[PDB]
Amino acid sequence: GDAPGGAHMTAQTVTGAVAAAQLGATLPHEHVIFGYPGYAGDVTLGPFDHAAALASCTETARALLARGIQTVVDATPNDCGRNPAFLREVSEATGLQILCATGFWYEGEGATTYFKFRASLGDAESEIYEMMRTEVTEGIAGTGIRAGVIKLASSRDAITPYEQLFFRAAARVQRETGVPIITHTQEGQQGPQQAELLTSLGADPARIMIGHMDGNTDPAYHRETLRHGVSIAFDRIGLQGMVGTPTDAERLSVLTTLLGEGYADRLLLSHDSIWHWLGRPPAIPEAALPAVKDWHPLHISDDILPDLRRRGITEEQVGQMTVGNPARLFG
């Protein structure tokens, strides 16, 4: 139907280029490793145990491959512990394909001081544009590993001025390279605003995925976002009751409504899971356990797809969301 249009480069994963056809079933928004900004200051008591992280992550990678998932899109922002080299180790040890991102997190929780300062002194937009373009076309930190997607993120009440610098820089790189863009929306807001802003800057709706859209349970919100021609992702499936998130039952209710309205070609599914935390491992209070019980990457494969099928969603619809959509969006 609506095919990417303009410049384009084959999907770049951490181990190199992959043809769209080789992407297979894909989880479009996950984190192999992740650290909240500040975690590096807790290095003495919260060091990265490389052997342990590698063992644990390759184990999860093998479990995903067992479910037929061939690709994961790692959406970790540059300021949240992003590590392309580690991702490459995990991919070379298991065969699982992994795309990594280029971008900064939203103003509310990102490491914003640096670029705010940069912007106080000059054209921060162009500096961000140069970073993004170099990371997508040449490589990250001199490793030769390129980013396969641009990550953008906005706050709840507005796409702030700080956030807009990244959106503008991304639109420029998108027009020039065709690279896909995936986003974070905070607490179920700004989905429509992100779609309008990006398309208004000349970014291709067929290479845009508005994320955390499962954060809103009013389908009018999703239909309005979809009116822009962009794809939307219910990418925190399994995270129930944390950071304003709804329950999976509520997500599936909205999802089946949209599927029944013919939107399968614009819907994607992920967990936004963290396979290994940076800093000191999080101690989950007893009472927060059910919120995170199904928040792991085998949840959609084992619980959601079956539940969708038993509700009347077809094998074609599941294949469209999990294989066809990723192939066109990232390939």
Stretch that binds Co ion, among 94-102, 130-138, 180-188, 198-206 (CB under 5 A): 180-188
Q: Are 141 and 84 in contact (CB under 8 A)?
A: yes
Residue closer to a second copy, measured from CB, 120 or 315? 120
- The rounded distance, in Å, linking the Cα atoms of 178 and 81 is 26
Minimum distance of Co ion from residue 272's CB (angstroms): 4
> Which helix H or strand E contains 128, and what residues bound it?
helix 124-137
Among residues 1, 3, 21, 44, the one that binds a second copy under rule CB under 8 A: 44
Would the annotation count 184 as a binding residue?
yes
Is 127 one of the binding residues for a second copy (CB under 8 A)? yes
- The rounded distance, in Å, linking the Cα atoms of 298 and 304 is 10
Site for Co ion in 261-290 (CB under 5 A): 272
Would the annotation count 272 as a binding residue?
yes
Q: Are 238 and 271 in contact (CB under 8 A)?
A: yes
Residue closer to a second copy, measured from CB, 121 or 249? 121
Binding track, positions 86-105, relative to a second copy; x by CB under 8 A: ------------------x-
Is 48 one of the binding residues for a second copy (CB under 8 A)? no
- The rounded distance, in Å, linking the Cα atoms of 70 and 62 is 10
Among residues 3, 285, 286, 315, the one that binds a second copy under rule CB under 8 A: 285
Which residues on neighbouring strands pair with residue 71, listed in sequence order?
A: 26, 97
Binding track, positions 66-105, relative to Co ion; x by CB under 5 A: ---------x------------------------------
Q: Which does 272 bind (CB under 5 to 8 A by kind): a second copy, Co ion, none?
A: Co ion
Q: Considering just the CA atoms, what is the radius of gyration of the chain in Å?
A: 18
- The rounded distance, in Å, linking the Cα atoms of 312 and 280 is 43
Q: Which residues contact 55 (CB under 8 A, 6 or more apart)?
A: none
Residue closer to Co ion, measured from CB, 75 or 173? 75
Site for a second copy in 61-80 (CB under 8 A): 77-79
Task: Classify the C-alpha dihedral 229-307-327-215 as positive or negative.
Answer: positive
- The rounded distance, in Å, linking the Cα atoms of 140 and 137 is 9
Binding track, positions 138-177, relative to a second copy; x by CB under 8 A: -xxxx-----------------------------------
Q: What is the DSSP string of 181-247?
A: EEEE-STT--HHHHHHHHHHTT--GGGEEE--GGG---HHHHHHHHTTT-EEEE--TT--SSTT---
Is 122 one of the binding residues for a second copy (CB under 8 A)? yes
Residue closer to Co ion, measured from CB, 38 or 202? 38
> Using CB under 5 A as the criterion, which residues of the chain lie in contact with Co ion when the complex forms?
75, 184, 272
